[PDB]
Design a protein around this nucleic acid. Structure first.
Ligand SMILES: *C[C@@H]1C(=O)C2CCN1CC2
Ligand SMILES: *C[C@@H]1C(=O)C2CCN1CC2
Ligand SMILES: *C[C@@H]1C(=O)C2CCN1CC2
Ligand SMILES: *C[C@@H]1C(=O)C2CCN1CC2
Ligand SMILES: *C[C@H]1C(=O)C2CCN1CC2
Ligand SMILES: *C[C@H]1C(=O)C2CCN1CC2
Ligand SMILES: [Zn+2]
Ligand SMILES: [Zn+2]
Lengths: 192, 192
DNA sequence: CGGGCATGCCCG
DNA sequence: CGGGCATGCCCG
């Protein structure tokens, strides 16, 4: 009955976790302390998928944004009117690049947007699979996120629709990821 | 042949001038030193029309915005996509309130927007006529003015289309007119 | 209300 | 590139 998707971590029977590359006032940088990606608009944000056990054939990887703060959690996250007017429907915040099987979904009941690609196991000798996401507005965009923090929820789903795993990370899309990560980490240490 | 309207002051044979009320970190405030109105979005910006000689019956008062800086002067000033989506067409920046004969014009050749009302002479004992303009975006709106200063051009035109007078003033539509007027006047004194 | 943060962007 | 302005908005 809820129109708010779960954000609860569920690493599940396949041992699903996300990973991030190591990254200066930079196009993206991930804070482990904050579980938060800082990235620039319309630029690559790589996300690694790690599993302990191989998901079945036909597994899918879905990404969806939700507002982090309770007061905004019921509002659908969408592209702002300016960037909408500038495969992906123009209203979608999150895109996937570099994939020939990307599907964009608008839920008929919840109106939430999501982007899905097939799960592919790592190549031999590799421990993870990387997806290249793109966020098409800044967190600050007027008429869109409007300075409200979001979480990205990554779910691993079988072809039948069973939830196999779920993880999430906060995102700030901003002009100066390195500056803003340093500011937020310092604020955590000083006032958190 | 130009699609850029003239901004040259022409006080003309009727002695046409504009005047502004005297106005604190306020909903509007006018700087004589800068010839610049500082006002808030979607709030009244009164403009006084002064003449030495009475214009003929059927005279009209037109207002049009143009970008002040040479680099932007050929671009039409429009409402940003966010405020457009929130009588006046939604794309028009400048509205007139309190008038039952307001006309909104989109020029078929230049694409410029303007808003026109009939000229009315002052009531007996008064020396000026006041029009209540409204600016429907901040100067800073992304996808609209985008922090570029504008001028408002006020023309007095007869019913036949003859230009009787023209005046202009700079406008900054902003959250804190009193703060910003003080900052700009101090910068003029210190660095201008 | 005024002080001061915010954050995309400017300038060196 | 990094320092620091910008400017709608937050908090007291
Ligand atoms: C987004 C950034 C980059 O461009 C590389 C890969 C992931 N992060 C860290 C370095
Ligand atoms: C999971 C692995 C790694 O740790 C490196 C970068 C991404 N994949 C391929 C090699
Ligand atoms: C816009 C402001 C106001 O609200 C009054 C009239 C004109 N200015 C100065 C005071
Ligand atoms: C021009 C006149 C004035 O100076 C005051 C305010 C506006 N009109 C009416 C009275
Ligand atoms: C964050 C800051 C930088 O370091 C350059 C890119 C974006 N912004 C302006 C210059
Ligand atoms: C300009 C500043 C003020 O003084 C109040 C109105 C708008 N802004 C926030 C509070
Ligand atoms: Zn946007
Ligand atoms: Zn606007």
């Amino acid at each position: 009955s809820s129109s708010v998707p779960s954000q609860k971590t569920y690493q599940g029977s396949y041992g699903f976790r996300l990973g991030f590359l190591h990254s200066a006032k930079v196009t993206c940088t991930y804070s482990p302390a904050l579980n938060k990606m800082f990235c620039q608009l319309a630029k690559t944000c790589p996300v690694q998928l790690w599993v302990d056990s191989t998901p079945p054939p036909g597994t899918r990887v879905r990404a969806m944004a939700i507002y982090k703060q309770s007061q905004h959690m019921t509002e659908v996250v969408r592209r702002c009117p300016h960037h909408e007017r500038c495969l992906a429907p123009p209203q979608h915040l999150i895109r996937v690049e570099g994939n020939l099987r990307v599907e964009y979904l608008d839920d008929r009941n919840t109106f939430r947007h999501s982007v899905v690609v097939p799960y592919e196991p790592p190549e031999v000798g590799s421990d993870c699979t990387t997806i290249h996401y793109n966020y098409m507005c800044n967190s600050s965009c007027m008429g869109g996120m409007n300075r409200r923090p979001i979480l990205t929820i990554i779910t691993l789903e079988d072809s039948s629709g069973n939830l196999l795993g779920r993880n999430s990370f906060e995102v700030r899309v901003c002009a100066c990821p390195g500056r803003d990560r340093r500011t937020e980490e310092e604020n955590l240490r000083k006032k958190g």
